[PDB]
């Protein structure tokens, strides 16, 4: 089968800057009928792949003109003249010359934007869950950049380890920011054993770490 | 009209 | 243009059949291809089918693993996976090879079907509200959400106000708990003035267990 090598595998581009992705095939993609069946695809987070270009340089009519394609028999290049926020996703090359169809490894295009401080919110455990015998406290970091952020759980000013998990959304297609949710899970017995619950957030946008807290029962 | 496609879909077309 | 069936939980060694409903075009005039997405960025071509006569062309890797059929009366394409292992847990897509200016390419894709191969039974999620309060308001904007906890397998669909509220919504990716079950949160930022007037409902649907929950999030003092 034809091997499709994409370089690079990850790419960070600022809004308005060019971007280039290369694809190299193990054999010449020029078919005997004279056509070169090379396709470029884009896969945005949570969506199916979509054809950007087919036959090396022909754009699908819906695709904006800032995407372009070039390349010969074995070396190919996808170019974005001016990267926009919606261009985030994974880019594939697809050959249609030799059976079977083979895709590339995929190139992740990430947007670079200025630092943005997170909005911090904390949520006490619900009454429905406390009836079940467990307690979950959620700390929300909303719309921040970069992706690196430190969330520490302190229960009565005691640092917690091994009882919380974090999740961070993929980059936003409009403002290119991230959001993070940290869930501190304790038994109902342990939750009633303490009073003050706080998450301490450390981030590049914050000059000093921000702390949101609540007292159990208010 | 019948379906056609890129040669990689069939072994006889691309291989 | 292409509508795929819902998520499947399949025991190892069993079979699963997923569908791809076509509409708005001549069904018998276009190939229907199937693509597997195993990892985050891994795409494999499974095969194609001619819906007119059912002629199939398979990738050598998926021969004896996938079977392609079509129902011309319902204009639906099917892929059956045989003797499933953990390696078959993936997202499967269907695509149409369309025609434009004498050239052919994958111009229409389905949303994808998540297939999980596991010996465990489905477990429905518990939905708890993340109530807005003074500790979740920053400068006239409030934050509220829902906690979808302890479910298996993937995925879960969360909407707000039956799809009426989309601005400011963040549905976080599911995390794997130490118990082996998934958990996610869905939050939304709204004006703090609308807390008394506007009703906010999160709609949680876990198709593998037929769990539909509509939980209204109410403010707290």
Numbering used by the authors:
A (entry chain D): 1 to 27, 27A, 27B, 27C, 27D, 27E, 28 to 213
B (entry chain P): 2 to 16
C (entry chain C): 3 to 52, 52A, 53 to 82, 82A, 82B, 82C, 83 to 100, 100A, ...
Sentences from the study reporting this entry:
Circumsporozoite protein (CSP) is the most abundant protein on the surface of all Plasmodium sporozoites and is necessary for parasite development and infection. CSP contains an unusual central region consisting of multiple, short amino acid repeats whose sequence depends on the Plasmodium species. The PvCSP central region is composed of nonapeptides GDRA(A/D)GQPA and ANGAGNQPG characteristic of strains VK210 and VK247, respectively. The central region of CSP is immunodominant, and antibodies targeting the repeats can inhibit sporozoite infection.
Next, we co-crystalized the 2F2 Fab with five different peptides derived from PvCSPvk210 (210-1, 210-2, 210-3, 210-4, and 210-5) to gain molecular insights into the binding mode and cross-reactivity of mAb 2F2 binding to PvCSPvk210. (C) Top and side views of the 210-4 peptide (light blue) in the binding groove of the 2F2 Fab shown as surface representation (heavy chain [HC] shown in green and kappa chain [KC] shown in white). (E) Detailed interactions between Fab 2F2 and peptide 210-4. The recognition of PvCSPvk210 peptides by 2F2 is mediated mostly by residues localized in heavy chain complementarity-determining regions (HCDRs) 1, 2, and 3, and kappa chain complementarity-determining regions (KCDRs) 1 and 3. The antibody-antigen complex buries 848 Å2 on the Fab (437 Å2 on HC and 411 Å2 on KC) and 1023 Å2 on the 210-4 peptide. Peptide residues 1GRDADG6 are positioned between HCDR1 and 3 and do not interact with the light chain. The PvCSPvk210 one turn of a 310-helix is positioned in the hydrophobic pocket formed by KCDR1 residues of the antibody, and is stabilized by three H-bonds formed between A9 and the backbone of K.Gly91 and K.Phe96, and G10 and the sidechain of H.Ser58. R3 and Q7 play a central role in mediating the Fab-peptide interactions, forming six H-bonds with both heavy and light chain residues of the antibody, and contributing ~107 Å2 and ~ 156 Å2 of BSA, respectively. Nine germline-encoded aromatic residues form significant van der Waals interactions with the peptides, contributing a total of ~385 Å2 of buried surface area (BSA). To accommodate arginine residues present in the sequence of the PvCSPvk210 peptides, the 2F2 paratope has an overall electronegative potential.
